[PDB]
Design a protein around this ligand. Structure first.
Ligand code: CL
Length: 110
């Protein structure tokens, strides 16, 4: 046993992550707020607490400001068990339609 922070990105789509009860999951995704797109996260509310949610300019601003930005969400397990996290990249004015891109992660909290 020990605390670990597990970093998930776009590249880990469909991965299954095994974590301990005192771990953190840190999802780090690029985004371009000036296009109106944003990531939306869904998970069971009785399963994780949001320990931090952040949008920030890249630490090496080579290109234009805010392009891209980094969206980071850090989740802490509330309960042990198995759960799924879904992300969608879309504009706000969507009538529940399909997002431009989707990500899915499976999490086993042991
Ligand atoms: Cl975002």
């Amino acid at each position: 046993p020990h605390m670990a922070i597990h970093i998930l990105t776009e590249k880990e789509d469909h991965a299954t992550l095994h974590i301990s009860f005192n771990d953190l999951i840190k999802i780090q995704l690029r985004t371009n707020p000036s296009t109106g797109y944003a990531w939306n996260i869904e998970y069971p509310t009785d399963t994780f607490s949001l320990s931090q949610d952040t949008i920030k300019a890249e630490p090496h601003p080579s290109g234009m400001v805010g392009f891209p930005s980094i969206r980071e969400i850090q989740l802490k397990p509330l309960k042990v068990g198995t759960t799924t996290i879904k992300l969608g990249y879309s504009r706000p004015w969507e009538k529940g339609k399909e997002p431009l891109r989707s990500l899915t992660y499976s999490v086993v909290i042991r």
